[PDB]
Structure formats: structure tokens, C-alpha cells
């Protein structure tokens, strides 16, 4: 066991009430909103296929030119209450907001840089309006924060000289200032989700990542801090050199998910996945015909897949420059919400069930040993195979939305056929099992 | 690398026309019929829940008392042409018939024992009648043969004395005599599927199992012989001490199948699974309420699973003592044929497709590189995920029964969405793909 000053801090999962809330929430929304919404993937007449929030990179735009977009930042249709209504109706329990993305433009009126909402035609504290509106709807707010900052020339990607070292030290102090500011201005914040922390410069400052975690924890009782922030003494990220998870939850499943048979290790720690609706667009991109766009069921599948293996899922939205949401995203949130209103009991506050995966869908476990079958693929055999772990029997099955009893037939030892409902629900649906453990 | 005299004889899969036919047939029926069909799992007022064809063992019936059932053997409803019609309409391309099971009662009038159909009130050569009738329908016939024989007291489970040695020698001669007799009486036989070869007496005599294979291949050109017969110089069964398959196909998947993700190794050799409709009954049992009984779709799922992993499937029937089939088996055969009539292009002459398994069902691959999606679990997403191997693309998709066109949308690198059809086909169905390598 290798010695470390800046390695993991939790022994297993946190079970304090604030962490339990973070976990039980299960479903979140991600908001990527920044100056990139304005060009929306197009620069100087050329539409770039890469992620819209990286347009400065794709189009090789210098900082001063890029940040000049602030002069155009005027989201006149923005209404925080409406955004918070959209989230509440979707059935999200929390929202993660880009306080600052790689571009460096802050959505709050920071005292530490001029590149903020205050210095735009719009002027208003967007971040603050969102925090209050979301909290008024009972929705927790989590802050995304990019460490990498393309607006501060003291940023370095690596330390290759004596001068790189000095400038980077200034950069960390600046970052510290912004972080403490965010924590003090908005003390209802429940999580900091760090990104842009992969560069060798950060990896060589493991100590700073440990300090950032602790500082924010000192400021905000019960705050969660993600693993992506963290590098240890050796510069190993997420998990330390002893293989132990740093931060409060693992945060590397991004537009992908663990395999339901081969990656059961994920059930040993808290974890949160994030996803996009198109293939890889976080910020607003004007042309979604450029890649595949996911349907609501394809998204709900991923949400349930996450919970079924002990994880949260956050579904991303890229708001328009004018402050409204594009039709496809309004369609998505409505549809997710209709389904979550019906079937959410098998998502919120649910967890890994301990059953072998079957082809029809996913199991989730409730707080009082309910086992939910979430059926995404309807068998023509009209029978849903349930193989039970050693010592577990199925006593009853119920269609969740109607209460109607479902036939359960033993087929071999440790195996049942659970009947499909007599009328096809016509959408993914839930059957609830009552189970019994021996001994 | 261990030198063997009685190990594997093939390198890889046989590819002579006889073996190609064995393989392309894909769907077989099993018939377990013998004296056990008379009591049907009940003896002296006790119904036994175990496999009816083992009732002699469950009820501890002495050989003399058990073989007396021969006096009650009179299958008045038997008609080999009706049996052949039932098979043909099920879509079975071959039938494996118990020439004799463990009980030792022979379905053909053997010269080498008194315990045959000849010495019953029915008298007739059931086996010969079946062989002709199946053959006239274009159906290949395979012979199940139990080496273990509870009717011959020279049988031994192990050889631990001079008397054991002398007796078991007589038994091997007898067995050789019956095998030669079957091969010469019925020269259209396409396969011998040996069973009851698990005892130490057989394992210790690997030479003999190699001899029986060779003897029969010489008598019946192109004949197939199952791995279950065979033990090598070291007593290792099915696969020899160098890990190589003995006989012509692997024959251990009995009432179970290989895992579609973890057991892709089975694709390297020919193999044949068998299954029962109830949990474990091969011969006729009078009470099918004692265990779970599979539905037709549950059976078709297993057939398709087998072909998807390069294997044959044989579905068992246990005819009634009277020569007719029980209502549940008639319904099964009919339902399977109906489906095979619609979707058989994706089963017959098909094989493993080399694609990663998906939740909606199975891939099979046709002879002209067609790739069939056989769908058992309809996604509410209206999309069927197809992840292609490195360097393969999907060019069209088609509802097999209606010809109707199917949208194929690329989702990421090496992944597609295939739409369901506009009308839910309403049962397991087939969508056919054209693919392209580079
Ligand atoms: O997970 C969200 C995602 N994180 C980074 C790529 O991993 C960012 O570069 C990207 O723009 C986006 O914010
Ligand atoms: O595969 C068919 C099966 N084989 C033996 C058990 O494995 C026999 O004991 C059984 O009766 C049946 O014939």
C-alpha cells in the first residue's frame, strides 16, 4: 500500500444525509450555456462538425476575438422560472450548470475577471437567477466548473519551463478565488463537478486538487465533489495509486455506460453518468442533422441502465443564444417527464438489485426491498425470464401503474417466467416484484 | 502434445456433402419410444416425477418384470406415414429414433436378443417402417443407441474382476453385432447418436469406441457419429487429451445451451443440442402438470439460439403407448411448422454470423452472406441495435414475410439502428441484412 498525502479520503460510500440525497435524486439535467451558443458551431461562414462548445478550438479563434462574443450576449427570452418549470416537469431532481466552461466566460458576475455576464448587454446574474428558480421548485443545484480556462493567459497545459511554473501558480490562486466566490455567493450549492482537469499541469498539482476539495467542503456543509477533479501525489486521476476512489463519486462515464454483466464493480462506489442528445454536442449547435439524435426512449433506457447499476444519470441540454430551448429539447423533456411521472418509483431512490441481467430490460431495487422490472424489450413469448440469486424467491408480481396481479410461474430451480401484462402498455413499463430471502 | 491412437480423427469440421447435409438440416426431432410408454411414469399406484424412460430404475423393477411389458406392446394407432407427415409439417429435416433405450427393448427385430418388437403382439418392424416413411418425405433418419443395456446381464458399470472382464467382453461383442445389424438392415441411416457411454467400463475401453466409429463409417459411407460415444487412450470423453473433438460433432448440450457471449468457442466445431418440452421427460409421461412445459415460442427461441451459435437442435417427442402423439405435442409440432414455414430461411442452412449478441434476439448467417436478425424481444424504442464487426456495413433491411423496406440509421462508428416494421409482425420475426466488408 503506497504512501500518499493527497489520495482518497472516503472509506467506501458516504452515508451522511447530504450524500444520500445526491444519490436518491438519481436523475439530473445538465445545462451547457456560454458564449458558444451565439455562433452555435459556425465561424466565419464555416459550420464545424465538432462539439459546439469547442468552436474556439476548431476554428482557431484567438481569445480576444472569441470573448468579443460578450458584446452579443443578450438572451432576451431567458426566464429562469420557465427553465425551472421545464426541469421540474421533466422529473429531474437536480440540475448541473456550467458556471464557467473552457472558454472562461462566467455566468455569474465574478469579481475576479471581466469576462462575465455583468459585461454584456444583458447584465443580469444568470447563475443566481437559475439557482433561486431551481431551488424554488425543490430542485438541487450543482455547479459545473472548468479548471482549464482559455481566457486566462496564466493557464498552462504542461510545465516545461521555470516561467510556466510561476504563471500556473497565479492561475491556481485565481481559480481558488472564483471557487470560494461561487461557494459564498450561492450557499445552496450541493455539488461541484470539475472538468478540464486532465492536462499534465493539473496532474502535477495533485495537492491543489485535494486542497480544492477540502476548501469547498469547509465552505459548504455536505457538499459533494466529483472524482474528475482529483489527482493524487503521482498524478493518477479519479482513483489513487492504491486504487481508491478520490472525491465523493466516480465521474468518468460520459456518453457511455458500464456493461451490465462485465462491469459490476461500479456498484461498490457512488457514481454519476452524463450524456448528450446528439452524438457529441454539449453546447448549442445550430445543425443537429450532422450526427445521430437520440429519441426519448433511447434516453430513458440510459437513465434506467445507470440506476440499475447504482449510478445517477444527467441528461444534457444546450440552450439557445436567445435564452430559449430548441424544439427537440422541449420535446425530450416533456416525454421524459410523462414517463417519469408514471414510472419514476423504479428510478428515484433506487439502486442495484443483485440479479443477473436479462434481455428484456433492467432491474432496480427500492428502499424497502422492492425489486422492479423495467421492460424495454417485449418478448413475443409473453414471458419475462427472472433468474433469482441463491436463496431468493419471488412471492408476487404487480403491474406498477394499474395494481393488476401478474402470473409468476417457476420454470426450474432459481428461475421464473413472469407474465407480460394482458394489454401491452405500449411503452417501457414496470412490474414490481415482492421477493423473499432465506436464512 | 500427447500421442494418441484413439483420439480425434477429424481436423476441424468435416466438409464432405454428408456432413454439410447433417449441418444444413439444423432442425431435428427426437423420438423416445419404448416399453416405458406403457406405464407412463406410474408403477404400482405411485406416479414418479422422474423421467419416465428411467421408471425401471425409479421403481426398482427387476429386468424380468420390466421386459414383460412386451406382452402389452400393441400400438394399434401407429402409422409411420402419419408420423412422417407430422415431422414434415413441423419442418424437421431429420428424426433421431431410439432404436433401443437403456431398457434394452429393440424397435427392430434384432437377431441377437429376444427383447424386440418381433416378440410382441404387434410383431411389426417399427424402425423399418419409420425409416421408409420418413425417407419418402425427404427426412433423414438418425439412430439413437444406448450402449448401456439393462436387459443384458453381461453389462458392467466397471471392470473389477476376471468375471467382469469375461462378461463385458461378451457384452461388447453383442453390441457390435447389433450395430452391424442396424447398419446393414437400414443402409439409409445418416447418423448414430450413442448414449449410455458414461460408465467406467466404457471409458476404460476407448479402443472399442474408436473401433465402433470406424466399423460404422466403413459400413455406412458418410455416416455421422456423435462425440458422446467416444473416449480416448486416456479415458477422456468427447474431446481427447489434446483438446480435439472426437466423432463428427459435439453432443453434450442436453436441455441447456451455450452462452451467446461467453461460449463462442462452440463455433469452431459442429455440434447438436437436444431438448425436452417438459423440464426433464424424454419418454411418455402421463402427467405433464408435474413440471414446467415449454410453449412453442420458448422452443423456437432455443432452436434459433442453437443455429446462431453454429449448432443443430433436436426437439423431443415421447409418443403414447398406442402409437399416437399427445395433444400438447401435436400443437407444438404444428406451431413450429407454421413459424418455420414463414421464417425458415434464417434457420435452414444457416450458421454463426460473427456479430456481437444484442438483447432483441439472434443473428444467423445464410450461405450467400445474408445476415438475418431473428427478433424475439421487440424494443419499444422501435429500434434494433446492430453493432457491426470491424470493417462491416449494413446496406439494406427487409421484412422477410412481406418484402417491406426497413430504415437503417447509423448511430456511431460500427453501430446502427434498424427500425422495427410499421405493423408489429406480432410474433418472432425476421429482418434480413446485406453487408459489405472492405
Ligand atoms: O462531460 C461534459 C464534457 N466534458 C468535457 C469532455 O470530457 C468537455 O470538454 C465537454 O465540452 C463537456 O463539458
Ligand atoms: O439426451 C437424451 C437423454 N440422454 C440420457 C441422459 O443424458 C438418457 O438417460 C435420457 O433418458 C435421454 O435419452
Ligand 1: distance of its center to the CA of A2 in Å?
A: 31
- Cβ within 8 Å, pair B292-A381: no
- Cβ within 8 Å, pair B409-A381: no
For A6-24, b/e burial (b = at least 16 CB within 10 A) is: bbbbeeebbeeebbebbbe
Contact A41, A321 (CB under 8 A): no
Ligand 1: distance of its center to the CA of A195 in Å?
A: 7
Is the C-alpha dihedral spanning B347, B350, B351, B354 positive or negative? negative
Distance from C-alpha of B310 to C-alpha of A31, rounded to nearest angstrom:
49
CB contact set of A40 (below 8 Å; sequence gap of 6+): A52, A283, A284, A285, A286, A320, A321
Which of A86, A202, A112, A223 has the alpha carbon at shortest distance from A155? A202
C-alpha cell at A239: 482513483
Contact B60, B307 (CB under 8 A): no
> Nearest ligand, CA of residue B252?
2
Report whether residue A274 contacts ligand 1, using a CB cutoff of 6 Å. yes
Dihedral of CA atoms B170, B175, B178, B182 in degrees, nearest 10, equals -160
Q: Which residues pair with A278 in a beta bridge?
A: A293
Distance from C-alpha of B315 to C-alpha of B333, rounded to nearest angstrom:
10
Atom from ligand 2 closest to the CA of residue B283: 11
Which of A162, A152, A149, A100 has the alpha carbon at shortest distance from A127? A100
Q: Could you count the other beta carbons within 10 Å of the beta carbon of residue A147?
A: 26
Atom from ligand 2 closest to the CA of residue B53: 11
**A298 reaches B (C-beta below 8 A):** yes
The number of angstroms, rounded, from the C-alpha of B79 to the middle of its chain's C-alpha atoms is: 23
Contact A80, A128 (CB under 8 A): no
**B255 reaches A (C-beta below 8 A):** no
Contact A248, A224 (CB under 8 A): yes
**A296 reaches B (C-beta below 8 A):** no
Report whether residue B199 contacts ligand 2, using a CB cutoff of 6 Å. no
Say how many Å lie between the first and final Cα of chain B, rounded. Answer: 38
Q: Of the candidates B292, B378, B417, which has its C-beta nearest A380's C-beta?
A: B378
- Cβ within 8 Å, pair A380-B377: yes
Which of B265, B274, B283, B205 has the alpha carbon at shortest distance from B6? B205
- Cβ within 8 Å, pair B379-A376: yes
Q: Of the candidates B295, B359, B409, which has its C-beta nearest A377's C-beta?
A: B359
Residue with cell 456433402: B17
Distance from C-alpha of B276 to C-alpha of B253, rounded to nearest angstrom:
12
Nearest CA in chain B to A381: B297
CA dist A166 → A177, A198, A201, A207 (Å): 17, 20, 12, 16
Q: Of the candidates A298, A376, A379, which has its C-beta nearest B376's C-beta?
A: A379
Atom from ligand 1 closest to the CA of residue A144: 13
| B412 conformational bin, left if phi > 0, alpha if psi -120 to 50, beta if neither | beta
Contact A221, A18 (CB under 8 A): yes
Q: Of the candidates B297, B380, B412, which has its C-beta nearest A428's C-beta?
A: B380
C-alpha cell at B161: 474382476
C-alpha cell at A438: 432465506
> Nearest ligand, CA of residue B144?
2
| B329 conformational bin, left if phi > 0, alpha if psi -120 to 50, beta if neither | alpha
C-alpha cell at B34: 419404448
CA dist A150 → A101, A125, A204 (Å): 9, 22, 19
Q: Are strands A42-43 and A46-47 parallel, antiparallel or unpaired?
A: antiparallel
Distance from CA of B407 to the nearest CA of A (A): 14
- Cβ within 8 Å, pair B377-A359: yes
Distance from CA of A106 to the nearest CA of B (A): 33
Report whether residue A272 contacts ligand 1, using a CB cutoff of 6 Å. no
- What values do phi and psi take at B43, rounded to 5? -145, 125
C-alpha cell at B235: 479415458
Neighbour-count burial of A161, counting CB atoms closer than 10 A to its CB (0-12 exposed, 13-18 middle, 19+ buried): exposed
- Cβ within 8 Å, pair A301-B410: no
Report whether residue B143 contacts ligand 2, using a CB cutoff of 6 Å. no
Ligand 1: distance of its center to the CA of A159 in Å?
A: 23
Is the C-alpha dihedral spanning B176, B182, B188, B189 positive or negative? negative
- Cβ within 8 Å, pair B297-A426: no
Distance from C-alpha of A310 to C-alpha of A305, rounded to nearest angstrom:
9
Distance from C-alpha of A108 to C-alpha of B40, rounded to nearest angstrom:
82
Question: What is the count of residue pairs from A and B with beta carbons less than 8 Å apart?
Answer: 66
Q: Could you count the other beta carbons within 10 Å of the beta carbon of residue A318?
A: 28
Q: Are strands A140-146 and A94-98 parallel, antiparallel or unpaired?
A: parallel
CA angle A201–A202–A203, rounded 5-degree value: 95
CA dist B392 → B183, B291, B355, B370, B387 (Å): 47, 45, 10, 13, 9
Contact A34, A319 (CB under 8 A): no
CA angle B341–B346–B348, rounded 5-degree value: 75
The length of chain A in residues reads: 439
CB contact set of A139 (below 8 Å; sequence gap of 6+): A84, A87, A88, A92, A93, A94, A95
**B411 reaches A (C-beta below 8 A):** yes
Nearest CA in chain B to A358: B359
Tell me the residues of chain B between 371 and 390 that have a Cβ less than 8 Å away from chain A: 375-383
Report whether residue A195 contacts ligand 1, using a CB cutoff of 6 Å. yes
Contact A10, A271 (CB under 8 A): no
Which of A393, A399, A389, A439 has the alpha carbon at shortest distance from A423? A399
C-alpha cell at A66: 472569441
C-alpha cell at B429: 420475426
**A410 reaches B (C-beta below 8 A):** yes
The number of angstroms, rounded, from the C-alpha of B69 to the middle of its chain's C-alpha atoms is: 27
Which of B52, B139, B65, B58 has the alpha carbon at shortest distance from B101? B52
**B16 reaches A (C-beta below 8 A):** no
Nearest alpha carbon, ligand 1 atom 11: A53
- Cβ within 8 Å, pair A377-B383: no
Contact B282, B241 (CB under 8 A): no
- What values do phi and psi take at A243, rounded to 5? 80, 20
CA angle B141–B144–B148, rounded 5-degree value: 165
Distance from C-alpha of A210 to C-alpha of A236, rounded to nearest angstrom:
13
The number of angstroms, rounded, from the C-alpha of B201 to the middle of its chain's C-alpha atoms is: 25
Distance from C-alpha of B438 to C-alpha of B127, rounded to nearest angstrom:
52
Which of A411, A404, A354, A346 has the alpha carbon at shortest distance from A374? A346
Report whether residue B103 contacts ligand 2, using a CB cutoff of 6 Å. no
For B192-211, b/e burial (b = at least 16 CB within 10 A) is: bbbbbbeeebbbebbebbbe
Declared resolution, Å: 1.8
Neighbour-count burial of A410, counting CB atoms closer than 10 A to its CB (0-12 exposed, 13-18 middle, 19+ buried): middle
For A62-74, b/e burial (b = at least 16 CB within 10 A) is: ebeebbebbeebe
CB contact set of B377 (below 8 Å; sequence gap of 6+): A359, A360, A377, A378, A379, A380, B359, B360, B361
Distance from C-alpha of A45 to C-alpha of A434, rounded to nearest angstrom:
60
Selected residue of B294, B381, B424 to mutate for chain A interface (largest A Cβ count, 10 A): B381
CA dist B17 → A348, B22, B221, B357 (Å): 60, 9, 11, 30
CB contact set of B92 (below 8 Å; sequence gap of 6+): B27, B28, B29, B139, B315
Distance from C-alpha of A412 to C-alpha of B345, rounded to nearest angstrom:
32
Q: Of the candidates B292, B297, B417, which has its C-beta nearest A380's C-beta?
A: B297
**B412 reaches A (C-beta below 8 A):** yes
Contact A318, A332 (CB under 8 A): no
C-alpha cell at A213: 476539495
3-state secondary structure B11-39: CCCCCCHHHHHHHHHCEEEEECCCHHHCC
Distance from C-alpha of A119 to C-alpha of A104, rounded to nearest angstrom:
13
Q: Which residues pair with B96 in a beta bridge?
A: B30, B142
**A339 reaches B (C-beta below 8 A):** no
Mutate to test the pocket of ligand 2, among B53, B195, B229 (most ligand atoms within 8 A of CB): B195
- Cβ within 8 Å, pair A410-B292: yes
Residue with cell 418484402: B403
Report whether residue A254 contacts ligand 1, using a CB cutoff of 6 Å. yes
**B145 reaches A (C-beta below 8 A):** no
Q: Are strands B191-195 and B46-47 parallel, antiparallel or unpaired?
A: unpaired
Distance from C-alpha of A160 to C-alpha of A279, rounded to nearest angstrom:
35
Contacts of A339 in chain B (CB under 8 A): none
Say how many Å lie between the first and final Cα of chain A, rounded. Answer: 37
Q: Which residues pair with B351 in a beta bridge?
A: B365
Which of B242, B245, B243 has the alpha carbon at shortest distance from B213? B245
The number of angstroms, rounded, from the C-alpha of B106 to the middle of its chain's C-alpha atoms is: 20
Contacts of A417 in chain B (CB under 8 A): 292
Distance from C-alpha of A174 to C-alpha of B382, rounded to nearest angstrom:
50
- What values do phi and psi take at A326, rounded to 5? -60, 150
- Cβ within 8 Å, pair A298-B383: yes
Write down the experimental method used for this entry. Answer: X-ray
CB contact set of B327 (below 8 Å; sequence gap of 6+): none
Question: Could you give all domains of chain B from N- to C-terminal order, each with its CATH number?
Answer: 16-348 (3.20.20.80), 349-438 (2.60.40.1180)
Distance from C-alpha of B99 to C-alpha of B358, rounded to nearest angstrom:
41
Contact A435, A392 (CB under 8 A): yes
> Nearest ligand, CA of residue A145?
1
Distance from CA of B80 to the nearest CA of A (A): 32
Distance from C-alpha of B141 to C-alpha of B183, rounded to nearest angstrom:
12
Which of A377, A226, A338 has the alpha carbon at shortest distance from B424? A377
CA angle B52–B56–B61, rounded 5-degree value: 150
3-state secondary structure chain A: CCCCCCCCCCCCCCCCHHHHHHHHHCEEEEECCCHHHCCCCEECCEECCCCHHHHHHHCCCCHHHHHHHHHHCCCCCCCHHHHHHHHHHHCCCEEEEECECCCCCECCCCCCCCCEHHHCCCCCCHHHHHHHHHHHCCCEEEEEEECCCCCCCCCCCCCCCHHHHHHHHHHHHHHHHHHHHHHHHCCCEEEEEEECCCCHHHHCCHHHHHHHHHHHHHHCCCCEEEHHHCECCCCCECECCCCCECCCEECCCECCCCCCCCCHHHHHCCEEEEECCECCCCCCCCCHHHCCECCHHHHHHHHHHHHHCCEEEEEEECCCCCCCCCHHHHHHHHHHHHHHHHHHHHCCCCECCCCCCECCEEEEECCCCCEEEEECEEECCCEEEEECCCCEEEEEEEECCCCCECCEEEEECCEEEEECCCCCCCCCEEEEEEEEECC
Selected residue of B290, B379, B380 to mutate for chain A interface (largest A Cβ count, 10 A): B380
- What values do phi and psi take at A198, rounded to 5? -90, -10
3-state secondary structure chain B: CCCCCCCCCCCCCCCCHHHHHHHHHCEEEEECCCHHHCCCCEECCEECCCCHHHHHHHCCCCHHHHHHHHHHCCCCCCCHHHHHHHHHHHCCCEEEEEEECCCCCECCCCCCCCCEHHHCCCCCCHHHHHHHHHHHCCCEEEEEEECCCCCCCCCCCCCCCHHHHHHHHHHHHHHHHHHHHHHHHCCCCCEEEEECCCCHHHHCCHHHHHHHHHHHHHHCCCCEEEHHHCECCCCCECECCCCCECCCEECCCECCCCCCCCCHHHHHCCEEEEECCECCCCCCCCCHHHCCECCHHHHHHHHHHHHHCCEEEEEEECCCCCCCCCHHHHHHHHHHHHHHHHHHHHCCCCECCCCCCECCEEEEECCCCCEEEEECEEECCCEEEEECCCCCEEEEEEECCCCCECCEEEEECCEEEEECCCCCCCCCEEEEEEEECC
Contact B431, B382 (CB under 8 A): no
Q: Could you count the other beta carbons within 10 Å of the beta carbon of residue A262?
A: 8
- Cβ within 8 Å, pair B378-A377: yes
Residue with cell 445476415: B371
Amino acid at each position: 500500500e503506497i504512501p500518499l498525502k493527497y489520495g482518497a479520503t472516503n472509506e467506501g460510500k458516504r452515508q451522511d444525509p447530504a450524500m444520500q440525497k445526491f444519490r436518491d435524486n438519481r436523475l439530473g439535467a445538465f445545462i451547457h450555456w456560454g458564449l458558444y451558443a451565439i455562433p452555435g458551431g459556425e465561424w466565419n461562414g464555416k459550420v464545424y462538425g465538432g462539439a459546439a462548445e469547442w468552436l474556439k478550438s476548431w476554428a482557431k479563434v484567438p481569445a480576444d476575438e472569441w470573448l468579443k462574443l460578450m458584446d452579443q450576449w443578450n438572451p432576451t427570452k431567458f426566464d429562469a422560472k420557465k427553465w425551472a418549470k421545464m426541469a421540474k416537469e421533466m422529473g429531474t431532481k437536480y440540475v448541473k450548470i456550467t458556471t464557467k466552461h473552457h472558454e472562461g466566460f462566467c455566468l455569474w458576475p465574478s469579481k475576479y475577471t471581466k469576462y462575465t455576464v455583468a459585461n454584456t448587454p444583458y447584465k443580469r446574474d444568470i447563475l443566481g437567477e437559475l439557482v433561486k428558480a431551481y431551488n424554488d421548485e425543490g430542485i438541487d443545484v450543482h455547479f459545473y466548473f472548468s479548471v482549464m480556462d482559455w481566457s486566462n493567459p496564466d493557464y498552462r497545459y504542461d510545465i516545461k519551463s521555470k516561467e510556466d511554473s510561476i504563471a500556473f501558480s497565479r492561475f491556481l490562486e485565481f481559480t481558488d478565488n472564483q471557487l470560494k466566490e461561487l461557494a459564498t455567493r450561492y450557499p445552496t450549492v450541493k455539488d461541484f463537478w470539475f472538468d478540464g482537469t486532465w492536462d499534465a499541469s493539473v496532474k502535477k498539482n495533485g495537492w491543489w486538487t485535494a486542497h480544492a476539495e477540502q476548501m469547498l467542503k469547509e465552505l459548504v456543509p455536505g457538499v459533494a465533489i466529483n472524482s474528475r477533479l482529483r489527482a493524487d501525489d503521482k498524478g493518477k486521476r479519479h482513483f489513487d495509486s492504491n486504487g481508491r476512489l478520490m472525491g465523493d463519486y466516480e465521474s468518468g462515464y460520459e456518453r457511455r455506460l458500464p456493461d451490465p454483466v462485465k462491469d459490476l464493480k461500479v456498484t461498490q462506489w457512488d457514481w454519476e453518468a452524463c450524456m448528450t442528445i446528439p452524438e457529441n454536442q454539449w453546447g448549442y449547435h445550430k445543425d443537429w442533422s450532422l450526427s445521430y439524435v437520440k429519441t426519448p426512449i433511447e434516453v430513458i433506457d440510459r437513465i434506467v441502465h445507470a440506476v440499475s447499476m447504482g449510478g445517477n444519470m444527467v441528461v444534457n441540454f444546450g440552450p439557445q443564444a436567445d435564452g430559449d430551448f430548441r424544439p427537440e429539447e422541449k420535446a425530450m423533456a416533456t416525454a421524459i417527464g410523462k414517463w417519469m411521472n408514471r414510472y419514476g418509483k423504479a428510478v428515484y431512490a433506487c439502486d442495484y438489485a443483485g440479479f443477473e441481467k436479462q434481455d428484456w430490460g433492467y432491474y432496480t431495487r427500492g428502499k424497502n426491498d422492492e425489486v422492479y422490472m423495467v421492460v424495454f424489450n417485449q418478448p413475443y413469448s409473453e414471458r419475462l425470464i427472472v433468474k433469482t440469486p441463491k436463496g431468493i424467491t419471488v412471492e408476487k408480481a404487480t403491474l406498477l401503474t394499474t395494481g393488476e396481479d401478474i402470473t409468476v410461474v417457476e420454470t426450474t430451480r432459481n428461475e421464473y417466467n413472469v407474465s407480460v401484462p394482458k394489454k401491452n402498455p405500449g411503452e417501457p413499463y414496470v412490474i414490481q416484484l415482492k421477493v423473499r430471502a432465506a436464512k
